[PDB]
Symmetry: D3
Subunit: 261 residues, 6 copies
């Protein structure tokens, strides 16, 4: 059986330089997909740039409850459990305890509708800080919107302990394995080969490696503690060695169209 | 629960200036969708203009049985009940009595296939002069094509008396409420606020306000008795007051992708 | 009932001049669809040309097991039954006897995923040399991928003897009739009128006429024994007589969006 | 010599509907050129629409000293002679006696630089209300700029009395005759035929007919007393009889590229 | 000095397949420039295809007095010396003795204006069948236009005998040598290498190699006796050996922007 | 006279992130112009990105003799004085004494021709490390090319001591003053305001402020010791205070089209 590998760049539309770093990683490299933040003021610009300069790039919706220095789509009065005193999303460190699931539902539904103001349907759903995999209840809300909009959803488990998350997916399509290891002190070529061998060795059909390529702008510097390594990711994801490795292993580079509902 | 508001401009492709007036109302204003006439000779040009200058605009198919000075897609010999002596569609005032439902089916099916010559699937179906809501039999024909092409269909009721139309939709998705009031002597900002409050006050999830923005050309003047107010609609739909009002009420501006089947 | 006629150009992306000959036949002529070879190194370029210069053109995936001078998508080690000693596809004359159905499945699945690297979903499936209609087992593999990706599939029967192929389609949508006669010594206007009358005379709803328009380049000359007549096809498919004939018969020119699943 | 006829639509960029009516008159008719107002807030949008939807349209700069409800590019403190007490351009009826030629030069220089924020060089110069033809001093300022930027300039004479104006141009290229009669009560096909005859019957080589095609928006309505006839101009300029009239007379349709320096 | 080599494909716009074969030879090969026939009905389509699919291609005007089965831009009554009894250009074999230089001037002026209906200025001038090099009088007409429009002109001498032709150009910029040998029986890689050596071995700075790349359509077949070798030209001009040959010789690939006035 | 201010970003095309940071600074800020390095392998990609995503951006050629880790366009055997033993440009610290002016001319000619492989003419000339201002002989070579190609040239003086440089330009148009202070430790809003005051307070008409906006990629990191401050330049140049500062001073933002010859 062939192996299908989705290499998805998180945080499309986060900032202008993140958007262009992702486009680089796709056009010159092995990124086949991205997921975009409608909660970001740069979202529509990002989607326009993709339309004209990266028309081959597959794009899903990056839901959030914890985006630093941003507000939800819905007015605070409607989603009061989701925000701090000034109306911004709660920090990931403390959000799980505050949020009300019905409000999370409404806000994420709003985020999906907001994406589609781009004139495009997302091809899938995932989340910033993997908050849809923080616990089964949040996951449950993601799966409900997946069914409602008939979109596949990122595999939420990144631990053996949460492997049972996937029994909840059922009709909602998802990669067989979430390879989340390519991050911060693991940013290197070697990690990538390692993950590729993992794909070649397992029983799965569809695999996702996520990543965070970007160019640096002050907006990213202002907004994310994960900043300078993102350029190193571009470098690795556009390297000849990486492209050859996928080649040598017969791996098929795919997108979430392979999981359409 | 959030409120989703589809603001749909009728008559895309009607005439070159109507098409550009709609594009203005979308790009500078709150129009999120339009429905296009394949029976119009300007249709394909309109769809090209949208592709290059309004790529964010959602577009559905505007079926007709009564378009002034136009002919059906199918040759007269095949749809003889639909046309006057010279082969043009019957006037709305007298069409209901003449047309044969099987011919209406074939012609509307033809209109849908004709749309898709644009290379694009419509995202929904509605009708010129709301002829799919003239009576249950015509409605029935619209719902049959909705099921056949798996497209949501505009809510046909604009009266309490026809509220029972919606019990026929079933699997065919539709807005919970048709807000048709924004027209001719009701063209003003106030009407729009009124309709918005109506949305905020009701139990519905998805609402549609239709409208007829346009620029004026001689072609429109020649062809529609509803002419000069269409520019006033552009003005109102692109006003800061209108945009702010939707904002103040937390309303989500959506399109028929929110009702995909 | 109206008649829907899909005129599909085979071999999009085969060579640069084939691609542009097909675009000509669509933009100036009656070709409404094409099917593209992801196994061709020119595939992505072809898909880009369509995006910018033929945005109205509908495009499906042209699966193959026999493309002269090409290799499968999957490495030879994974599909060893599909290739000659140097790793190229077996010649159509001898392939049926060599190939292993599981390998055919994997390779065609790979070809579909490869198409979608264009950023676009195919709207349907067919095959080079009609190899999906060579026998029921190969057909069976095509239908399995049709169901998996939820795509309509070209009618595989071109003989009375294989009419029973269609009983296997079931949920997989397909034209009611495959009109394959427009080829080599039958290339003429007359053949086309003949096929059109056939459509007007039969009970079917959806019909497909396939064809092989192209401009000539050395790459085509090097690679296909069917070369010089392809320009004659462009000429006929862009002729006023052909356009008028479809007109005179009330035939609707359609694409596989009319058969969406 | 051949006869070369430039048909130039004045007021590109005035309002969104004006802009689009001009594009229509070009794409569907005999307008070969337009002149744009950088003094208008819709100017840059107009140049983007031209770039993507009317690439064949030639565009010059429409200089002004009198545009209703508009202000100079330069701050009023720098051009005090050019404006009324509120900062707006003087009306055409009395500006002549007010303006300082040095300020006229600086402001028109500013307008040309302003045009070039579009990233395009104008292909020629003219003026709103023909103010460069109001007297020989204003003409001299216009010529000074035409020489600085090396651009052709519209023939400023519209009377037998100002025929001597042409003797000042020297190296600045211009059409041999200004045909200004197509306006307001003279808007009709007849007038156009009459002017084409005049082209045929005079000694000149290069002729310019100016015009004011537009679609109608409220903005035009509010801003100009010459409004509804502009759609009749579009009609006449896109008409078959006019295109034929030009051909039958062996007149060549040209733009100011024919007069580049 | 460096050596600058212009490789110009003649006959852009002749037929749709010619146009596309030239775009291929540019995008995949060493063609840096083309010259277009405004006298062809496919000319404007050719310039649109270049704009969107070959933005880097430089384009001049291909003037003619002899194009098979074609007519002048001007009506025959205005250029009676230029045409046979049926209104078509005289064949190259006997036009020399027929044409009136004044009519040649007006018609070539017309052709250049015609080019500019594309909304683009040609970057240089040349001629079909090298008729501007047929004798010094025809050359003088060509030079007169080159000076009027301020455009460089192809070196008209193709014999030691007409070397003195160059003494007439004065201010009109031209390549130092016309390398015309790449044609018909001399179509091969060898020839190209030979001409590159000639470039290396002469004293000139700027050299032009002309060529006739094309894809084949029936239109070309019907219109030109030089047909099938044009695809071999595409092959040779897109070949690795030719690109390498140029590099190894330290030759710079240029266009007529290098000769702008 | 008005005051015209050109804000030119140096190093377009250096790296993909530099290119995009410059597009950002233009589209969201006050950069009106850029100068591109044809000596960079990313140059043609940069010009394509500008064509489709920054059509309003003006672009000149950035000539060089000193670019780190880069080589001349011409083979080293043709320009031996311009390179170290390994074929790379001499460092700015000692190139002055090495180079042969004839080789400088040929190489810079080559760079300009190289630019024009983009299919665009540069709108002006400048140089990396201001090497055209290093002494009057290098300036003379630059002027010779400016005259050959008829292009304006950046003001080479950056000291009271080289004010006499301007006396050499003659017909070559240039800004009145080079404002070079916005660099490295002086990167701040203050500096910019200071330079705007200088514009206000001097006698000149036309001023140039140069700058080095960029996003960060590893390529920039590896290639230039001036790296992280470039993002601060983007920030400052897209800031509201800077846009306001320019307006409040009545300064006109211009590009080198204002200085075309």
């Amino acid at each position: 059986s062939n192996k299908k590998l989705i290499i998805n760049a998180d945080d499309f539309g986060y900032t202008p330089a993140v958007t262009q770093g992702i486009i680089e990683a796709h056009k010159r490299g092995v990124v086949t997909s991205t997921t975009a933040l409608p909660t970001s003021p740069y979202f529509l610009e990002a989607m326009e740039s993709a339309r004209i300069s990266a028309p081959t790039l597959a794009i899903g919706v990056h839901l959030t409850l914890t985006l630093n220095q941003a507000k939800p789509i819905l007015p605070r009065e409607m989603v009061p459990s989701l925000v701090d005193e000034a109306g911004y999303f709660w920090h990931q460190s403390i959000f799980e305890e505050k949020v009300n699931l019905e409000e999370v539902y409404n806000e994420w539904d709003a985020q999906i509708i907001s994406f589609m103001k781009s004139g495009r349907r997302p091809d899938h759903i995932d989340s910033h800080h993997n908050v849809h995999g923080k616990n089964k209840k949040l996951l449950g809300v993601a799966l409900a919107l997946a069914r409602k909009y008939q979109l596949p959803l990122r595999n939420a488990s990144r631990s053996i302990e949460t492997k049972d998350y996937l029994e909840l997916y059922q009709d909602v399509r998802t990669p067989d394995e979430m390879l989340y290891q390519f991050y911060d002190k693991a940013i290197s070529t070697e990690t990538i080969l390692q993950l590729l061998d993992m794909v070649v060795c397992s029983e799965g059909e569809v695999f996702e490696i996520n990543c965070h390529p970007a160019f640096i702008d002050t907006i990213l510097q202002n907004q994310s503690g994960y900043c300078m390594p993102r350029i190193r990711e571009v470098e690795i994801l556009t390297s000849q060695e990486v492209k050859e490795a996928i080649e040598e292993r017969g791996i098929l580079l795919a997108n979430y169209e392979s999981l359409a509902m």
